[PDB]
Motif scaffolding. Structure first.
Motif, mmCIF file in Angstrom:
data_model
loop_
_atom_site.group_PDB
_atom_site.id
_atom_site.type_symbol
_atom_site.label_atom_id
_atom_site.label_comp_id
_atom_site.label_asym_id
_atom_site.label_seq_id
_atom_site.Cartn_x
_atom_site.Cartn_y
_atom_site.Cartn_z
ATOM 1 N N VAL A 653 0.850 -1.169 0.000
ATOM 2 C CA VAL A 653 0.000 0.000 0.000
ATOM 3 C C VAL A 653 0.891 1.226 0.000
ATOM 4 O O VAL A 653 0.752 2.091 -0.863
ATOM 5 C CB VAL A 653 -0.928 0.030 1.225
ATOM 6 C CG1 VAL A 653 -1.765 1.298 1.210
ATOM 7 C CG2 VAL A 653 -1.844 -1.176 1.202
ATOM 8 N N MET A 654 1.815 1.284 0.960
ATOM 9 C CA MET A 654 2.740 2.406 1.081
ATOM 10 C C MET A 654 3.415 2.667 -0.262
ATOM 11 O O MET A 654 3.665 3.813 -0.625
ATOM 12 C CB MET A 654 3.823 2.099 2.116
ATOM 13 C CG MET A 654 3.344 1.768 3.519
ATOM 14 S SD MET A 654 3.024 3.224 4.540
ATOM 15 C CE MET A 654 1.282 2.926 4.982
ATOM 16 N N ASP A 655 3.712 1.596 -0.993
ATOM 17 C CA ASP A 655 4.370 1.724 -2.281
ATOM 18 C C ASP A 655 3.626 2.613 -3.252
ATOM 19 O O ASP A 655 4.240 3.199 -4.137
ATOM 20 C CB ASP A 655 4.577 0.357 -2.921
ATOM 21 C CG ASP A 655 5.683 -0.441 -2.251
ATOM 22 O OD1 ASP A 655 6.597 0.187 -1.668
ATOM 23 O OD2 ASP A 655 5.651 -1.697 -2.319
ATOM 24 N N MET A 656 2.312 2.720 -3.094
ATOM 25 C CA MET A 656 1.505 3.547 -3.976
ATOM 26 C C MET A 656 1.784 5.049 -3.851
ATOM 27 O O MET A 656 1.511 5.825 -4.774
ATOM 28 C CB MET A 656 0.027 3.266 -3.728
ATOM 29 C CG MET A 656 -0.392 1.890 -4.178
ATOM 30 S SD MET A 656 -2.076 1.463 -3.764
ATOM 31 C CE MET A 656 -1.792 0.111 -2.658
ATOM 32 N N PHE A 661 -2.068 7.820 -8.209
ATOM 33 C CA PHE A 661 -3.328 8.158 -7.558
ATOM 34 C C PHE A 661 -3.113 8.853 -6.231
ATOM 35 O O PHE A 661 -3.644 9.936 -6.018
ATOM 36 C CB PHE A 661 -4.156 6.892 -7.350
ATOM 37 C CG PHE A 661 -5.413 7.113 -6.585
ATOM 38 C CD1 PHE A 661 -6.365 8.025 -7.038
ATOM 39 C CD2 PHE A 661 -5.656 6.400 -5.407
ATOM 40 C CE1 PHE A 661 -7.555 8.226 -6.325
ATOM 41 C CE2 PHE A 661 -6.839 6.589 -4.683
ATOM 42 C CZ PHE A 661 -7.792 7.503 -5.143
ATOM 43 N N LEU A 662 -2.350 8.211 -5.343
ATOM 44 C CA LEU A 662 -2.052 8.763 -4.027
ATOM 45 C C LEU A 662 -0.871 9.702 -4.105
ATOM 46 O O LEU A 662 0.246 9.280 -4.387
ATOM 47 C CB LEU A 662 -1.709 7.658 -3.039
ATOM 48 C CG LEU A 662 -2.831 6.960 -2.296
ATOM 49 C CD1 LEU A 662 -2.252 6.111 -1.193
ATOM 50 C CD2 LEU A 662 -3.749 7.995 -1.688
ATOM 51 N N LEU A 706 -5.639 13.083 -3.368
ATOM 52 C CA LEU A 706 -6.039 12.040 -4.297
ATOM 53 C C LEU A 706 -6.121 12.608 -5.709
ATOM 54 O O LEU A 706 -6.929 13.497 -5.992
ATOM 55 C CB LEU A 706 -7.381 11.435 -3.874
ATOM 56 C CG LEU A 706 -7.423 10.844 -2.450
ATOM 57 C CD1 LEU A 706 -8.793 10.238 -2.176
ATOM 58 C CD2 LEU A 706 -6.333 9.790 -2.273
ATOM 59 N N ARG A 707 -5.263 12.094 -6.590
ATOM 60 C CA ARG A 707 -5.210 12.542 -7.968
ATOM 61 C C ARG A 707 -6.318 11.913 -8.823
ATOM 62 O O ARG A 707 -6.250 10.744 -9.199
ATOM 63 C CB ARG A 707 -3.827 12.219 -8.557
ATOM 64 C CG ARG A 707 -2.670 12.951 -7.886
ATOM 65 C CD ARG A 707 -2.447 14.346 -8.495
ATOM 66 N NE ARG A 707 -1.804 15.311 -7.586
ATOM 67 C CZ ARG A 707 -0.516 15.319 -7.241
ATOM 68 N NH1 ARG A 707 0.324 14.406 -7.720
ATOM 69 N NH2 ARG A 707 -0.064 16.258 -6.416
ATOM 70 N N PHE A 906 0.984 1.055 -11.353
ATOM 71 C CA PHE A 906 0.530 2.433 -11.230
ATOM 72 C C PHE A 906 -0.936 2.527 -10.800
ATOM 73 O O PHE A 906 -1.661 1.540 -10.804
ATOM 74 C CB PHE A 906 0.748 3.162 -12.553
ATOM 75 C CG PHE A 906 2.195 3.318 -12.922
ATOM 76 C CD1 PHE A 906 2.950 4.379 -12.416
ATOM 77 C CD2 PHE A 906 2.826 2.374 -13.728
ATOM 78 C CE1 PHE A 906 4.313 4.496 -12.705
ATOM 79 C CE2 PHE A 906 4.186 2.478 -14.024
ATOM 80 C CZ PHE A 906 4.932 3.540 -13.512
ATOM 81 N N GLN A 907 -1.361 3.721 -10.404
ATOM 82 C CA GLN A 907 -2.738 3.943 -9.982
ATOM 83 C C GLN A 907 -3.270 5.127 -10.781
ATOM 84 O O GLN A 907 -2.512 6.004 -11.196
ATOM 85 C CB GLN A 907 -2.821 4.303 -8.495
ATOM 86 C CG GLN A 907 -1.741 3.728 -7.582
ATOM 87 C CD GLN A 907 -1.823 2.229 -7.480
ATOM 88 O OE1 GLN A 907 -2.879 1.686 -7.177
ATOM 89 N NE2 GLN A 907 -0.711 1.546 -7.729
#
Ligand SMILES: [Hg+2]
Ligand SMILES: [Hg+2]
Ligand SMILES: [Hg+2]
Ligand SMILES: [Hg+2]
Ligand SMILES: [Zn+2]
Length: 1028
Positions: A653-656, A661-662, A706-707, A906-907
């Motif tokens: 999660v942290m990796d995001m 997105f984050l 939040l992008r 990616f997000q």
């Protein structure tokens, strides 16, 4: 380099005497159930806290050995304070009766636990009365509330805190005196202890430092009860953990032990019933922790937005002399009502996505969409099953409702669940719900109440004299909007957030970049110059009623916008060449960011709940997308698999962070003389400033925003081949509105009234009465027809411009698309549904507020309307559509929209849509070529509205040795060769400094020598800029 943050307590208990004016206002912003002495009010400088109040702080969380040093952890104050004594002085958010009773039974209906103080602890409770005595305040003319840091509110209700009675002080709020007792962690007395404390009253616990004088935990029932309900409840529900107390302890665990990874939610959390379904269940608890953990990160973070200050709210300007400033606030909150309405009736709203579903893999291949949130409000009654899918205890018997379809019931019990089973919050929920249903396609409240007397009502919460305001009635009135969950596939999340950025990319062509944004700005500037528009109100006629008075005026206006747009596009494109056109626009997309900043949310505990719930959903979604990879090739049924791999799920999660997105940021906390309670003298003695300690972890890493983005360029986007009617064309809005001015004798045979509809219909079918068109009308009709034809030829924005503002932007967009040889398809468009408010449009709408509810109900209603001005909370929401987002986002609004996160690692936050159709909002139109946003402005209400002598004489301040150089540049970058004209007098004005002005005179001269006597560059800047 490194950021600083003052050491402080984890919170304070504020106590003051009942104010006697701005209370009516405080109440409106607050949340309070009429049958309870507690309430939750927003954190507002000048209202609930003093002016120098500093939100960001390093709280003293514990102590270490090696002599004892203190442990500090950064955190910020929760966006709302908790009133545990004095709620009676706040007008109930609703007349709705017995909300406390309703929550109680609803909680039992869905299986959640209730607050249960231990009998053997009561003798240690600190009562409001008790504190009022020490403070010398009147227990019936007093307000006591908790002001806490986001990271320890949960620590407070589990009695892991204590009052430092010796550190008492006073502050001023609105001229009034206010007492405040600092709150600290019991752990302080337990060196090298990072765990939550069970039995915090045991003064003989082995971990307690020796010779230490263990304090008395700060145990208050009304307070603890309110936190459990208003702070732990929402999370409890959100993370589907029916043992509420357990949830509270999990959050505390994360707050006291920064190094904690692994399970946090109870080891025996149960699961709503509706290999085997084993992984599904597992993916939910792990995502549950994943989210609880992520939220904790944000709680121990430090944001840049400052706490709101009522005296800064432009919302009061003018309409603020009389204490009837309360109306302004009342009308404001009313707008938001429309948003909370959508958040309750959208079938995919964050408030409903509380269960997780397993769609199976797509067998080791990626599966970022296998696990996902689904609505589960209608299933919270089903049986609770354990880790292995077996019913637990008191659930045997219960019927298990289907996840999709079935005849669902949305009663008060449910509404109470969405608000964490908190009557205090639920009250504010109804406050808004009561301001809703701007229906125009459909109940007689008065008739209903009347024909219900002693007729056996299906509700044991109200009576004849209260039916007008009872939940059941309100819900009856909104029955048509009730959520019917019928979708089985993974959907988008309906989030509530606030776009607080000064920058957004929602121009007709999004972020297509001088840059494209610049161009649209200059054009809007230009148009404003011509006085054809009001940059802030696209819907405004701005002097056009004056300009356009003859059909020659039409000619000039159309030619001017066309001309200014062509000019600016002609330039922008030419510049872009001096970049890949065709490739560049198929890439650009609309974009906006939603802050995670706790102070960007609305000034209401309810509007806050909504944002908090939304984010939790968004976090779980992310956590969820990583679960399958975490399970892949692992014996997933291990006894404590959760404690074994959560660390991984957590890391994925942290990796995001900053990965699409984050949006995330890092802060390095500077180390160090510290004032803090004495570990020996007792909680009564004064603060001991002997202690000197640092922050355990010097590095802060947390999500910031939040992008969300939506692809601009693209089946159903196929531009029909048929021509568009002139009246529904690019000039349709102008032709209709100024028909009488352009075509004076344009009235049909029989009528003496110039009717554009008639005229252009007959004009287009030849059914126009023989030789009517003036000798000059033909030239205009011609002109009109050609523009309509040209625009139409290049138009790819499937929407008719409704004002010059839109007419210019669409045309400009269409011109840029023509330059790139765009073809065949319409582009994607954005539409904002602006949330507005107004006085009740009928007596009916005021029913629930009548002071008289029996036979005098309909009269009470009428009386209410007769004196509407006296009721500052008597407003109602209404909506307006807007296809020009630029102005909307300029107001840094609170928003409600559909968000679908895709993970490909990616997000991308795909701008989706709210489900439930017209029920989420009546202005929502189904059309795959457009996206929507419900928006409530902030700037101009609770935020500042949407200067060289200053900038210069600002550099002369915070400036080093090159002030001369720096200032010269700025002057030049603000004045072309104009700088050369400046005489010593001019300079002395721009800089109230004689020395500097002479320097400016020497510089300006030299730069002239460089150009040999022809102004141009400032290489002389850098040259002098040498004083290093
Ligand atoms: Hg009072
Ligand atoms: Hg001190
Ligand atoms: Hg607008
Ligand atoms: Hg709406
Ligand atoms: Zn009722």
């Amino acid at each position: 380099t490194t950021i600083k943050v003052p050491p402080g307590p984890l919170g304070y208990v504020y106590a003051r005497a009942c104010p006697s004016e701005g209370i009516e206002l405080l109440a409106l912003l607050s949340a309070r159930s009429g049958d309870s002495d507690v309430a939750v009010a927003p954190l507002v400088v000048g209202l609930t806290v003093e002016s120098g109040f500093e939100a960001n702080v390093a709280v003293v969380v514990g102590s270490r050995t090696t002599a004892v040093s203190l442990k500090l952890t950064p955190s910020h104050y929760s966006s709302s304070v908790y009133v545990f004594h004095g709620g009676r002085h706040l007008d109930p958010s609703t007349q709705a009766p017995n909300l406390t009773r309703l929550c109680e039974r609803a909680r039992r209906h869905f299986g959640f636990s209730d607050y249960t103080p231990r009998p053997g602890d009561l003798k240690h409770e600190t009562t409001g009365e008790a504190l009022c005595e020490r403070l010398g305040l009147d227990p019936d003319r007093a307000l006591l509330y908790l002001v806490v840091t986001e990271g320890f509110k949960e620590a407070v209700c589990i009695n892991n805190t204590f009052l430092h009675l010796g550190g008492s002080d006073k502050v001023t709020i609105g001229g009034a005196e206010v007492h405040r007792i600092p709150v600290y962690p019991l752990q302080l007395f337990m060196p090298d202890f990072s765990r939550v404390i069970a039995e915090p009253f045991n003064a003989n616990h082995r971990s307690i430092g020796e010779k230490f004088t263990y304090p008395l935990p700060f145990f208050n029932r009304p307070l603890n009860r309110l936190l459990f309900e208003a702070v732990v409840g929402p999370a409890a529900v959100a993370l589907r953990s029916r043992n509420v107390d357990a949830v509270a302890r999990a959050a505390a665990h994360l707050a006291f032990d920064e190094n904690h990874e692994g399970a946090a939610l109870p080891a025996d959390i149960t699961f709503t019933a509706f290999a085997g379904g084993f992984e599904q269940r597992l993916a939910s608890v792990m995502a549950g922790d994943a989210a609880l953990a992520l939220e904790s990160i944000v709680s121990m973070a430090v944001f840049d937005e400052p706490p709101t200050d009522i005296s800064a709210w432009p919302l009061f300007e003018g309409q603020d002399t009389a204490a009837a400033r309360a109306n302004a606030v009342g009308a404001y909150l009313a707008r938001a009502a429309g948003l909370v309405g959508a958040m309750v009736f959208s079938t995919n709203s964050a408030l409903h996505l509380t269960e997780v579903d397993d769609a199976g893999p797509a067998h080791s291949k990626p599966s970022f969409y296998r696990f996902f949130l689904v609505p589960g409000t209608h299933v919270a009654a089903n049986p609770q099953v354990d880790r292995e899918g077996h019913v637990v205890p008191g659930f045997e018997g219960r019927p298990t409702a289907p996840l999709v379809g079935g005849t669902q019931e949305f009663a008060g019990e449910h509404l109470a669940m969405l608000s964490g089973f908190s009557p205090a919050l639920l009250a504010k929920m109804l406050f808004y719900l009561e301001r809703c249903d701007g229906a125009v396609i459909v109940m007689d409240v008065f008739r209903y109440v009347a024909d219900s007397n002693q007729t056996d009502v299906p509700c044991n919460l109200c009576t004849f004299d209260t039916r007008h305001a009872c939940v059941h009635t309100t819900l009856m009135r909104l029955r048509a909007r009730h959520p019917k969950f019928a979708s089985a596939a993974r959907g988008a999340i309906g989030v509530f957030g606030t776009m607080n950025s000064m920058y957004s990319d929602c121009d007709v062509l999004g972020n297509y970049a001088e840059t494209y944004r610049a161009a649209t700005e200059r054009v809007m500037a230009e148009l404003e110059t011509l006085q054809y528009v009001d940059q802030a109100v696209p819907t405004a006629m701005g002097r056009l009623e004056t300009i356009i008075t003859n059909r020659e005026a039409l000619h000039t206006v159309v030619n001017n916008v066309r001309q200014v747009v062509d000019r600016e596009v002609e330039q922008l494109m030419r510049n872009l060449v001096e970049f890949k056109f065709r490739d560049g626009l198929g890439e650009a997309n609309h974009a906006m960011s939603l802050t995670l900043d706790p102070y960007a949310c609305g000034p209401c505990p309810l509007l806050q709940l909504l944002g908090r719930r939304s984010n939790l959903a968004v976090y779980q979604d992310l956590a969820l997308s990583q679960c399958h990879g975490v399970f892949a090739g692992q014996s997933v049924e291990g006894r404590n698999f959760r404690n074994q791999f959560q660390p991984v799920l957590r890391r994925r999660v942290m990796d995001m962070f900053n990965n699409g997105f984050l949006s995330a940021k890092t802060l390095t906390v500077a180390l160090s003389a510290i004032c803090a309670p004495s570990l020996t003298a007792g909680q009564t003695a004064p603060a001991e400033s002997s202690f000197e300690g640092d922050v355990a972890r010097v590095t802060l890493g947390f999500p910031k925003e939040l992008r969300v983005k939506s692809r601009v360029l693209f089946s159903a986007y196929q531009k029909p081949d048929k021509r568009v009617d002139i009246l529904l064309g690019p000039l349709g809005f102008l032709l209709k509105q100024f028909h009488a001015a352009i075509f004076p004798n344009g009235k049909p045979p029989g009528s003496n009234q110039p009717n554009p509809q008639w005229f252009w219909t007959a004009l287009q079918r030849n059914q126009l009465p023989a030789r009517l068109l003036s000798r000059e009308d033909i030239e205009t009709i011609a002109f009109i027809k050609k523009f309509s034809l040209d625009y139409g030829a290049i138009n790819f924005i499937n929407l008719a411009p409704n004002n010059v503002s839109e007419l210019a932007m669409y045309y400009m967009a269409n011109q840029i698309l023509r330059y790139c040889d765009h073809s065949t398809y319409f582009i994607n468009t954005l539409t904002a549904i602006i949330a507005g408010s107004r006085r009740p449009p009928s007596v009916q709408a005021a029913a629930a507020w009548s002071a008289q509810g029996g036979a005098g109900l309909e009269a009470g209603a009428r009386a209410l309307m007769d004196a509407v001005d006296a009721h500052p909370g008597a407003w109602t929401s209404m909506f307006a559509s807007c296809n020009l987002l630029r102005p909307v986002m300029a107001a840094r609004p609170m928003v409600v929209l559909g968000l679908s996160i895709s993970k490909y690692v990616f997000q991308a936050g795909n701008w989706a849509s709210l489900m439930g159709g017209k029920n989420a909002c009546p202005l929502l139109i189904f059309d795959r070529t457009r996206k929507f946003v419900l928006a409530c402005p902030r700037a101009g209400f609770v935020c500042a509205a949407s200067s060289l002598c200053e900038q210069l004489r600002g550099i002369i301040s915070e400036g080093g040795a090159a002030v001369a150089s720096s200032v010269f540049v700025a002057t030049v970058k603000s004045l072309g060769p104009r700088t050369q004209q400046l005489q010593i007098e001019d300079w002395l004005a721009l800089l109230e400094d004689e020395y500097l002005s002479e320097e400016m005179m020497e510089l300006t001269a030299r730069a002239l020598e460089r150009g040999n006597g022809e102004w141009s560059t400032d290489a002389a800047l850098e040259v002098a800029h040498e004083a290093e």
